[PDB]
C-alpha cells in the first residue's frame, strides 16, 4: 500500500500545505507527481532511499523529506493557486500509486479582480469548429462582457486570406438580415447568433466575431469558428 | 486596397525582417496583427494616423514606423522562431484587412539540437481520446525514440484513483497476452500497441504507456488515452 493523506485540501493562496505519503511495500524509491490536462503526470521530487531527495522535472516552488523508508512527504512553503492539481505519490524498486490528493490553491483581492478585467475585455466564439450538411443552417455564437459595445461586426475567412466583413448588427436592434445570413442580438444576455441558412460547401471558412466600442475606437476579436459544410 | 509586401518570407534567428502595407483606402488608422492556432488574431502594434505608432496588445520584439498615410511598416530587428506565423496589416476609420504575409523564421543549430534532445526522451500516444462501441477491440499506440527503453509498462487509471499496472512487455519480446489485453511490439519501428479485444464499458479509463530503462533508472510517462467504452 501507499497511503497519502490528506486525500482533499483547499489552502489559501501564500500558505503553507504539507502533503504525506507512506507506503509498506517496502521499496526503496518513492516519487512526488503531479496530474494535470495536457501534462498527464509530471515529476516533482524523488527519493532514492532513506534521507536522500532528488529534484524531478519541476521542482519549483516544492521541497520533500524522506525522514524514514516508510516515509515521503511534499512541502508547499508558499502555495500559489498555479499548485492545484491531483498530487499521486509512488513508490517503487515496478511502481504503485498512491489513490492521489486533490489540492486546491485559492486566489486573491488581487487575483479575482484582474481575472474579472480579464474577462470584461474578451470576445468568446463558440463552438471553435462546427461541421454541417448541406442545407443545414449553421448557427454560430458569440458573447462579451462590457456593455459599452455597440457595433458587431461578423467576418469571413477563406484559407491562405486575410478576413473580410461579412454581417454587422449595431446593439439598437435584434436581428440583422442580408440574404443567407442573419444576425440575432441579445442585449440583455450579451450574447449573438449568426445563422447561415441553406449552408453551402463554399461557405467553408474561419468566422470571427468581433466587438467594437464605437466611441473608445478600439476593436476586440473572438478567436474563430471554423465551418465545414460537407456535400 | 491593403496591399502587403512581401507574401512569403524565410528569415534566419539571427536576422532583420521588414513587413510592409501600402493602403489606398485614405484611412488614418492602420494596424499590425498576427494570426496564431490557439490565440486568433492578436493586435502587435496600431497607428492613428501619419508619424504615430501605438504598440498593441503584443509589441514584444516589433517595431513600426507610419512614415505617411498610405504606408505602415512592421519591424522585427532580431527575428526568433517564435515570431513565425502569418501577418496580417488592417486599415479603418469599419476596418480592412490584406492578404497576409507568411513569415518563417528558422531554426539555429543549437535549437535542432536542443529539440532532439527532448523528443528523445518523450514517450508518445495516440489518440488523446478514444470512443468504441462495446465489443469492438480498442487499439491504443504508443511509440518512443530511444533505443535504450527495454520495459514498457501499461497503466490503468479509473476517475478519482491513482493508475494501477495493467500488462508489461520486455523488449526481448515481441507480443503479450493475458486474457483481453495484448501488446504488440515493435522493436525495429519503436512502436507498441495495446489491443483490448472484446472491450466492456468497465474498460473506459485513462491509459498511460510508460517505457522504463531497467540500466539507467528513469520511468518516462505518455500523456494518456481517455477510452470510452459505449454500452
Known amino acids: 500500500a501507499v497511503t497519502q493523506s490528506p486525500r482533499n485540501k483547499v489552502a489559501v493562496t501564500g500558505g503553507k500545505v504539507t502533503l504525506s505519503c507512506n507506503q509498506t511495500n517496502n521499496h526503496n524509491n518513492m516519487y512526488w507527481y503531479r496530474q494535470d490536462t495536457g501534462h498527464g503526470l509530471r515529476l516533482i521530487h524523488y527519493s532514492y532511499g532513506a534521507g536522500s531527495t532528488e529534484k524531478g522535472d519541476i521542482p519549483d516552488g516544492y521541497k520533500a523529506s524522506r525522514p524514514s523508508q516508510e516515509n515521503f512527504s511534499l512541502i508547499l512553503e508558499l502555495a500559489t493557486p498555479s499548485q492545484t492539481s491531483v498530487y499521486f505519490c509512488?513508490?517503487?524498486?515496478?511502481?504503485?500509486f498512491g489513490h492521489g490528493t486533490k489540492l486546491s490553491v485559492l486566489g486573491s483581492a488581487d487575483d479575482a479582480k484582474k481575472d474579472a478585467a480579464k474577462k470584461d475585455g474578451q470576445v468568446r466564439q463558440s463552438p471553435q469548429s462546427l461541421t454541417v450538411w448541406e442545407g443545414e443552417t449553421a448557427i454560430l455564437n458569440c458573447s462579451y462582457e462590457n456593455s459599452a459595445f455597440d457595433y458587431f461586426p461578423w467576418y469571413q475567412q477563406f484559407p491562405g486570406e486575410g478576413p473580410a466583413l461579412l454581417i454587422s448588427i449595431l446593439s439598437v436592434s435584434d436581428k440583422k438580415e442580408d440574404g443567407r445570413f442573419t444576425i440575432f442580438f441579445n442585449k440583455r444576455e450579451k450574447k449573438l447568433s449568426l445563422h447561415i441558412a441553406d449552408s453551402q460547401p463554399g461557405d467553408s471558412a474561419t468566422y470571427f466575431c468581433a466587438a467594437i466600442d464605437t466611441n473608445a475606437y478600439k476593436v476586440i476579436f473572438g478567436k474563430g469558428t471554423h465551418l465545414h459544410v460537407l456535400p | 486596397a491593403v496591399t502587403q509586401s512581401p507574401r512569403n518570407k524565410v528569415a534566419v534567428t539571427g536576422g532583420k525582417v521588414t513587413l510592409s502595407c501600402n493602403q489606398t483606402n485614405n484611412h488614418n488608422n492602420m494596424y499590425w496583427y498576427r494570426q496564431d492556432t490557439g490565440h486568433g488574431l492578436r493586435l502587435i502594434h496600431y497607428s492613428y494616423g501619419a508619424g504615430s505608432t501605438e504598440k498593441g496588445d503584443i509589441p514584444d520584439g516589433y517595431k513600426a514606423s507610419r512614415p505617411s498615410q498610405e504606408n505602415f511598416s512592421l519591424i522585427l530587428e532580431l527575428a526568433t522562431p517564435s515570431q513565425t506565423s502569418v501577418?496580417?496589416?488592417?486599415?479603418?476609420?469599419?476596418?480592412?484587412?490584406?492578404?497576409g504575409t507568411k513569415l518563417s523564421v528558422l531554426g539555429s543549430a543549437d535549437d535542432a539540437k536542443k529539440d532532439a534532445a527532448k523528443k528523445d526522451g518523450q514517450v508518445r500516444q495516440s489518440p488523446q481520446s478514444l470512443t468504441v462501441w462495446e465489443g469492438e477491440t480498442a487499439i491504443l499506440n504508443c511509440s518512443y525514440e530511444n533505443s535504450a527503453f527495454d520495459y514498457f509498462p501499461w497503466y490503468q487509471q479509473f476517475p478519482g484513483e491513482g493508475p494501477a499496472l495493467l500488462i508489461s512487455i520486455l523488449s526481448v519480446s515481441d507480443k503479450k497476452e493475458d486474457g483481453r489485453f495484448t501488446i504488440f511490439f515493435n522493436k525495429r519501428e519503436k512502436k507498441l500497441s495495446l489491443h483490448i479485444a472484446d472491450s466492456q464499458p468497465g474498460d473506459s479509463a485513462t491509459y498511460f504507456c510508460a517505457a522504463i530503462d531497467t540500466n539507467a533508472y528513469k520511468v518516462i510517462f505518455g500523456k494518456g488515452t481517455h477510452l470510452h467504452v459505449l454500452p
Open positions: 509512488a513508490s517503487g524498486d515496478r511502481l504503485f
